[PDB]
Amino acid sequence: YTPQQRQYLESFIEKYVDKTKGSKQYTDETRFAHANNRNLSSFRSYWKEMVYPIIAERSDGSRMWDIDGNEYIDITMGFGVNLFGHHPSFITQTVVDSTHSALPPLGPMSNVAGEVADRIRACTGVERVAFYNSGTEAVMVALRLARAATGRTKVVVFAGSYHGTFDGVLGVANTKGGAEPANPLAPGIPQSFMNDLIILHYNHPDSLDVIRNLGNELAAVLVEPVQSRRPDLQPESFLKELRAITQQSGTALIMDEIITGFRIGLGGAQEWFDIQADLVTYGKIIGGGQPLGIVAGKAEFMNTIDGGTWQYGDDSYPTDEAKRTFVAGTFNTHPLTMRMSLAVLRYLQAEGETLYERLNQKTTYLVDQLNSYFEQSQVPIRMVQFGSLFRFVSSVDNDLFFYHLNYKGVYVWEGRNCFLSTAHTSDDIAYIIQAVQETVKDLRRGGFI
Amino acid sequence: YTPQQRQYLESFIEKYVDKTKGSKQYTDETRFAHANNRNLSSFRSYWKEMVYPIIAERSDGSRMWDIDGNEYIDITMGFGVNLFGHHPSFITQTVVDSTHSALPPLGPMSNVAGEVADRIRACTGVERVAFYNSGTEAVMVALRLARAATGRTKVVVFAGSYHGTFDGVLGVANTKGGAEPANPLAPGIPQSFMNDLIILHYNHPDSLDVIRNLGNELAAVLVEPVQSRRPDLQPESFLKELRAITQQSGTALIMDEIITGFRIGLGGAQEWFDIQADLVTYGKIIGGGQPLGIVAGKAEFMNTIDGGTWQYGDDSYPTDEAKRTFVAGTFNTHPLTMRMSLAVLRYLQAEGETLYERLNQKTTYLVDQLNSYFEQSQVPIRMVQFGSLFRFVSSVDNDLFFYHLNYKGVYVWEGRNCFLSTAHTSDDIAYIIQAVQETVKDLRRGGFI
Numbered sequence: 001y002t003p004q005q006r007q008y009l010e011s012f013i014e015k016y017v018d019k020t021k022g023s024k025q026y027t028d029e030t031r032f033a034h035a036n037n038r039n040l041s042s043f044r045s046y047w048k049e050m051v052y053p054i055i056a057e058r059s060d061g062s063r064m065w066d067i068d069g070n071e072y073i074d075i076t077m078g079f080g081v082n083l084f085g086h087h088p089s090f091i092t093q094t095v096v097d098s099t100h101s102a103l104p105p106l107g108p109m110s111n112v113a114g115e116v117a118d119r120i121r122a123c124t125g126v127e128r129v130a131f132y133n134s135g136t137e138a139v140m141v142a143l144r145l146a147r148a149a150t151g152r153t154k155v156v157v158f159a160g161s162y163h164g165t166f167d168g169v170l171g172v173a174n175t176k177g178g179a180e181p182a183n184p185l186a187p188g189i190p191q192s193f194m195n196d197l198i199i200l201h202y203n204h205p206d207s208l209d210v211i212r213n214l215g216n217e218l219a220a221v222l223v224e225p226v227q228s229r230r231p232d233l234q235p236e237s238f239l240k241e242l243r244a245i246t247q248q249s250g251t252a253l254i255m256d257e258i259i260t261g262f263r264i265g266l267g268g269a270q271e272w273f274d275i276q277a278d279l280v281t282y283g284k285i286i287g288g289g290q291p292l293g294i295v296a297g298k299a300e301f302m303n304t305i306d307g308g309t310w311q312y313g314d315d316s317y318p319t320d321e322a323k324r325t326f327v328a329g330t331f332n333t334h335p336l337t338m339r340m341s342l343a344v345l346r347y348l349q350a351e352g353e354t355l356y357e358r359l360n361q362k363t364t365y366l367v368d369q370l371n372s373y374f375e376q377s378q379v380p381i382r383m384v385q386f387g388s389l390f391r392f393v394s395s396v397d398n399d400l401f402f403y404h405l406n407y408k409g410v411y412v413w414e415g416r417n418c419f420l421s422t423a424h425t426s427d428d429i430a431y432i433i434q435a436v437q438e439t440v441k442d443l444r445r446g447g448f449i
Numbered sequence: 450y451t452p453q454q455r456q457y458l459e460s461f462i463e464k465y466v467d468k469t470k471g472s473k474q475y476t477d478e479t480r481f482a483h484a485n486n487r488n489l490s491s492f493r494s495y496w497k498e499m500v501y502p503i504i505a506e507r508s509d510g511s512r513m514w515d516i517d518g519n520e521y522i523d524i525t526m527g528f529g530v531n532l533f534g535h536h537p538s539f540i541t542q543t544v545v546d547s548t549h550s551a552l553p554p555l556g557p558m559s560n561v562a563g564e565v566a567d568r569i570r571a572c573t574g575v576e577r578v579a580f581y582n583s584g585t586e587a588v589m590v591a592l593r594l595a596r597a598a599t600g601r602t603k604v605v606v607f608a609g610s611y612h613g614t615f616d617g618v619l620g621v622a623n624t625k626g627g628a629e630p631a632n633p634l635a636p637g638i639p640q641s642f643m644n645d646l647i648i649l650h651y652n653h654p655d656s657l658d659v660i661r662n663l664g665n666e667l668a669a670v671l672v673e674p675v676q677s678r679r680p681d682l683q684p685e686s687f688l689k690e691l692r693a694i695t696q697q698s699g700t701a702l703i704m705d706e707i708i709t710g711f712r713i714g715l716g717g718a719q720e721w722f723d724i725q726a727d728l729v730t731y732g733k734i735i736g737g738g739q740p741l742g743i744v745a746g747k748a749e750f751m752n753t754i755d756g757g758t759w760q761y762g763d764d765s766y767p768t769d770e771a772k773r774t775f776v777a778g779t780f781n782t783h784p785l786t787m788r789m790s791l792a793v794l795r796y797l798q799a800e801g802e803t804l805y806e807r808l809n810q811k812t813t814y815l816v817d818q819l820n821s822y823f824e825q826s827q828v829p830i831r832m833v834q835f836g837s838l839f840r841f842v843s844s845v846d847n848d849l850f851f852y853h854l855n856y857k858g859v860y861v862w863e864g865r866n867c868f869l870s871t872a873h874t875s876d877d878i879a880y881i882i883q884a885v886q887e888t889v890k891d892l893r894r895g896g897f898i
Contacts, residue, residue, distance in 0.1 A: 023558075024761065026560065026563065027558070028760070028761055029563065030562070030563030030566060030567075031755075031758055032576075032577060032748075032758050033563060033566035033567050033569075033570055033577060033578060034562055034563050034566040034577075034578060034579070034580075035577040035578060035579040035751045035752075035754040035755060036558070036562075036579065036754065036755060036781075036782075037754050037755050037773075037776050037777065038558065038755075039755050040755045040756055040767060040770075040773075043766075043767075045764075045766060048759075048761070048766070049761060053557065053558040054557045054558065055557065055558050055559070055560045056553035056554060056556070056557030056558065056559075056560065057553050057560055058551045058552070058553055059551070059552065059553050059554035060551055064553065064554050064556075064557060065553075066557065067560050074554065074556070076554075076556040076557070077554070077556065078554055078555030078556050078779070079555065079556060079779050080779075081555055081779065082554065082555070086552075086554045087551065087552070092548050095544070095547060095548050096545075096548040098544060099541055099544050099545050099548070101507070102507040102508060102509050102536065103507065103508070103536070104505035104506055104507055104508055104513065104514075105505060105508045105513055105523070105526075105527045105531065105535050106527035106528060106530055106531075106738075107505070107513070107523065107525035107526070107527045107528060107860070107862050108502065108503045108504060108505035108513060108515065108525070108860065108862070109472075109476075109485070109487060109488075109502040109503065109504050109505070110504070110505075111475065111504050111505065111506055111516050113479065113483050113485070114475060114478060114479030114482060114483050116483075117479060117482035117483040118479075118482050121482060127481070128481060128482060128483070128484040129482060129483060129484060130483070130484040130485065131483075131485075133582050133583040133585075133586070133740050133780075134581075134582040134583065134586060134778065134779065134780060135779060136582075136586065136778065137582070137583060137585060137586065137614070140614070140615070140616070141614075144616065144637045144638060145637065146637075147636075147637035147638075147639055148635070148636040148637025149637070151636065151637075153639040153640070153641065164777075165586075165589075165590070165775065165776060165777050165778060166589070166615075167589065167593065167615075167616075167617065168616065168642070170775055185775055186597070186773070186774040186775040187596075187597035187600070187753070187771075187772055187773070187774045188592075188593040188594060188595070188596035188597025188598070188753065188772075188774040189593060189596070189597075189774065189775070190596055190602040190644075190645050191602070192602065192641050192642070192644035192645045193617070193641065193642060193645075195641040195644075196639045196641045283779065284779060287780075289555065290780075291582050291740055291779075291780030291783060292780075299481070302484050303484075304636070304637065305484040305485065305486050306480070306484055306485060306486050306488050306489050307489060309480050309481045310480070311477060312473070312477055312497075312498060315494075317494055318489065318492075322636070323636050323637075324486075324635070324636070325635040325636055325637040325638060326486075326614070326619060326634050326635040326638065327486050327614060328486065328613070328614055329583065329585060329613075329614060330527075330528050330530065330583070330584060330732065330733060330740075331583060331736075331740035332485075333485070334740060337740075411556070411557060413556055413557070
């Protein structure tokens, strides 16, 4: 560093830590008893005096407060969960109605689950819908069904994608590339789990030309339609060639709409692109803040959860039993979760396509303005967008950038997927843009461009 | 079925469908939309016309009600989740505050999961606590950490144990037994996920030696202390010797305590057998009715989550970070869940050991009293137990038996793990005994003895 950068930092770290000395102690007091991989977030040794996450205390709409009192405008929003802001109207009415009503328990099946399923079909045009407890868990079911129906084993995922924390998708592509199998992403993930895994560059036509050369050997091909990491990239022609090649080869197309489902537009990325996959997995938003994973899609694949549907009065039976796999789970169809998932759908289905339209425009307000600021100031940053999911792209040292954003009361988190919601007022939208520009000026005066 | 029994049955189906007709109709109107492996339970094409799960509607204390408006005395207690009965004082209270006290949001770290970590430490002896979304998720991560801390791949699980839905534990015996790699449990669970599994007889004393062979090749032996399926089996000699071996072989001793943890006693299976595992999973009860799944244990293994600890002020940094592996989770340390987990913990440490001493012996009363009825009347049914988990071992058609238990107003799910709660009264114990005794009387009268 120059003498200028060192004394900017050795001075900002001072102002930051004093603003967040609540979270610093609480992370420091609880770091051992609470094992969380988020405590090491953005760890460099020369600013170690400010590496702790923000311990939040309250939230309401688009405002989140920490235990220091500080107020944040939230572009984190539960990693994608709170499309309607924190504690919206209909949601706590559901939560407040649970106290008044002697809710039913786990154990017996759910009287609400049938409705939640029909409305998901309504909004997305899938045939059958199951319920599990995380996106991780839903993705892991999805692979099992597709593997259970095709009776094959090898599956393809694309680098860049995220898909939960199920061991069978935690790979990196092969040293040899091509169609050769994946190697583990980290310690403790055994190679044996990677052998039925194949990884290919997404938006690389060479790889559509290897899904063909596997052709019949492929159980399923898992795709993050738009990748959380790279919202700007939304390849309609890649996916659609992929749809042709999988339906041609009898291979499952699995679409991961845990982030885009119910975000870009009611029908998810299925409605956007107008592509209908074999299996689609949903998460985050659809639980209304209760934990929730869902795997839905075509009956011809979904029939592996219960062997096939039947009716009363005749001699009919589940014809696919020789193909039904094993799926279980204690908190599946949770009573309160299944009811908040109703609130969300009944609200979303009422307020029309103009709930999404209004929110995509104001997210595009943000992306468009912030980028014009970046251009007429030659400042080397860019906003990328898909729906109300935006991110920052920048050769400028990222972690130091988002430290200022956090300082200035805009709570972005460590993955940096920032989201708007329908809770973000014009005050709020402007306050983000002011916080970005205050930052570029703070940071350029300190000589960091 | 003899000409006799065959007509008893047809009187039973009729009397049974009429009582639970709404659960029939709901289940049909939603079998397609809502895929759920549970809709197939106890399916036999002849008594087909009563093969539907019970759909609940409301509950409190120890009773559930179905949508046909039948009452039942719940002995399923939500698969063992509700130690405390349904909607206890403190759990529902904590809900009301969640609506009036403006919860923090997902995203920023929890300001409560530290006390829940501290509280768990007091109750179990675990060194470090980490929080996920399902018992399933907990086992999946626990193995990963084990495989990462030890740099080994191979894992032993025990036949008869249940450890959730991760594909890494969903295997069965290689017919040529021994220390051989296993076979899948269902179509679509890919054999590659069986390459590093090894499945040995629990309490076969040879299997104690197969672990001493693999000595350094085992990353972990995964043991459900008291197998849910076989509660009568409480093999302290075997486990103590399983501890000694794995310790000297530096192999992780994960103890799946999702059902045993906080049920047999506060320390759970660990406390009971006076054995400190390396890794212990927890779930079910410790969610206070919310979903939850925990992995806790010795830092020699937990440090693979963040990479080890370090302080503020001094030039420290994470040490075990070499062994740092991949974990995450959208719904981890959920603001409600953590508060109910806190709620449940506080409540537990308030009531003495008196709480458990009674629930186990209020069970014993039911267990013993019933076994004696069975010895007098020469009925081929015997009760088994571990604390407040109990089962019916019997040579009568079980499926016909529980239909009698269910129609008679005692709710028992398809998996037949039964638990009693603190909410059951003596009048409830009597009522269960009666409904059993008159089921024997009913089964006798029909010629099924």
